[PDB]
Symmetry: C2
Subunit: 291 residues, 2 copies
Amino acid sequence: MNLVSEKEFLDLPLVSVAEIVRCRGPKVSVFPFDGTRRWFHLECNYQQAALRQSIRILKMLFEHGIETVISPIFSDDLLDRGDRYIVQALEGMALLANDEEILSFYKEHEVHVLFYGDYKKRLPSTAQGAAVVKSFDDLTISTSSNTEHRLCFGVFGNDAAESVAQFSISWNETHGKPPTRREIIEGYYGEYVDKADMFIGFGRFSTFDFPLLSSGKTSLYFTVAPSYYMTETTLRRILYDHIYLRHFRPKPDYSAMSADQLNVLRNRYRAQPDRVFGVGCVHDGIWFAEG
Amino acid sequence: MNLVSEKEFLDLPLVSVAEIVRCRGPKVSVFPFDGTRRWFHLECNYQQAALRQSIRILKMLFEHGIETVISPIFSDDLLDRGDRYIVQALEGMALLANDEEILSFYKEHEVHVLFYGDYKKRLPSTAQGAAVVKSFDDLTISTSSNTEHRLCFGVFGNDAAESVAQFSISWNETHGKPPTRREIIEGYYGEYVDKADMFIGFGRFSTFDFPLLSSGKTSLYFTVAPSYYMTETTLRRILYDHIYLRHFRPKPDYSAMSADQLNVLRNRYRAQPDRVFGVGCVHDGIWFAEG
């Protein structure tokens, strides 16, 4: 339970890992679907392919015991692409709430789906967009009885400030008092969600689109390859690091360590004095982390 | 200007780097003062030493052209230490607003100092605490005429939600309309501050305490050694990566690349399929990033 080795963890059967996760966490994980286009021009040679991969990873995440997955899918730069790109995107959005296989996926894995972000005001003031919003509203309610997992799709969910302000102003007008943090979170995500226990990005070290759910306890990981490339081994090593390594116990007692130990520890830092993770190099316009 | 090499950037004189930064950014940088205790039991053998190091790094940051530094200094776990630890902390806080040398530092470098977080309600409901709050209020106003730099100290600045809600409710009651994002930020930090262009942490890959100032454009870096260990070389390599490498231009045009290029790029990922940054190992209870 508390003393499983990485090797065993890596050898254990799926159901076993899931049980460990259900107990130790991560309860909430952020997994944006990024680098999609790149993955497309490298493995397939769109909207339809991206989805099968999204479904694969989501399936994987939930089958490993993770209760809630927060997945940013569309951020600001969107409205700045061509008209066709926007249509392709709005179609992808429509697929998350309309496609046959993913709907089966939600039902098969008892997944309640929610959407967050500024999509209701930002989405194109057109028909196709009003359809996406209606679709989003419908799915959220129709998957309402599923209780095994929670899936939150981020659509323009990069800055919740103005949204929190307005949500708070209305709540106080109708309730007489300001909302609690819990109510603020329910208001934005549509349901209460604990802080994120980990964020798995890729490439450039950066996080985004999970307003109010971030804390110093959100373990950060950045794969070298794009989101859809996520393998089993990689996921388990990430899981193992967060569950067993990030918060090691008992904490360290310096005063109890020998003068040599402190010395060995000091060298772990001074041996390579200028070492830093996050600096990279560029190849074909693509940034890659060094060291 | 736009085509300075890393080597030149690393060889350039301080004033030169500062000029490049003033023009290209980072305009806002987050630098929490973490791992202080650890650095103490490794280099000095407290409250007074931590400050000289804090001053050194802050001085360094501002002298490199960075306009605003956001520095989380005290988070939640604080109130959970012994009574003496809390007193030592409240004394450190008092030093930021009272000590002779740092006050000279603010004046010498024309630094306006601001405090953010839940410290006004969370700080001990004692005398020494009411003194810190008064001290914080006084400093903020007394450094009000400095315009070269802005320093924001985070004291319990881990979750601004409830604070934004209440600030928004009052603002609407008095103004008749909800505040804008800009006003919400001014309300929380006491002045408007642009989103953070970078966050330099250390050890475990994680970010914290800069509510509302985070975006996908906040470049993340994690040194291997604790905050106070920050060297010149490390800072410039971080700066160089963010200014020149993170957002390379022109963007990549896949369709224009040869079949071999795409192939070489594909191998950069498939050669080492399970590579991920953020997984570590533990030594003496201390986590260290691998790879």
